[PDB]
Swiss-Prot record:
InterPro entries noted in UniProt: NAD/GMP_synthase (IPR022310), NAD_synthase (IPR003694), NH(3)-dep_NAD(+)_synth (IPR022926), Rossmann-like_a/b/a_fold (IPR014729)
Subunit structure: Homodimer.
Protein name according to UniProt: NH(3)-dependent NAD(+) synthetase
Family: Belongs to the NAD synthetase family.
Record: residues binding Mg(2+): D61, E177
Amino acid sequence: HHHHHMQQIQRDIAQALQVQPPFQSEADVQAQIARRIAFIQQCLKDSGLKTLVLGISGGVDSLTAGLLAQRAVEQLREQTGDQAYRFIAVRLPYQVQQDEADAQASLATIRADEEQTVNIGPSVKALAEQLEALEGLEPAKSDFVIGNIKARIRMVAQYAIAGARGGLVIGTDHAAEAVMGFFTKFGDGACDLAPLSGLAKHQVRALARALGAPENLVEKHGVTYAEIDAFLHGQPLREEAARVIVDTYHKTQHKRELPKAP
């Protein structure tokens, strides 16, 4: 009884997230790259816009989305002859050594048409200073609230560049991130198009490898991504992990919906 219902729950979650079936062949992998590149191009055409904007953090998700974006605009320039098609990669520096090294290495992999650097530090600090509600907060809560300010001002910076340059903002959400609600609402969850949607984490890595990323970048709630992916694909995993994934999914549903309305 319990098993049958948990099975139905897993299947309904995978359908809601449009989970991509596991890749069975190279044909599958190449088809997904082609589809997502075509999706990116179709978003530009439908919007009548020419520019793509994406923060490059150094992580594999933005590396993969960045590679798809750069290939998409290269193809559009070739086919249309319109040199205004451009991908703008955005560096949003912080103070994690490995991240910044990974970010530079990521940029070197993408070879984006254009790179811009936005230090959000001054803006985050200047907002913080005006929020009396931050005064007296316990340190763990303060760091969390300030962390989400940072994530949201990174969104604001990308949208400002897109507005300046007539662009769409790319987000890096995929099914392994989405099922756990592992993003800031109206921060990195906020974009115009999410070309990695539905992918399991190992599928994101598979695309990055097929797109030419170096191996060190490809492999760069108490639950692992291997567990999350097994859950998404309906494969065996520890019952306790399935429980945490389902409970987390339910708690975070509001992050995957529009604002509530009566």
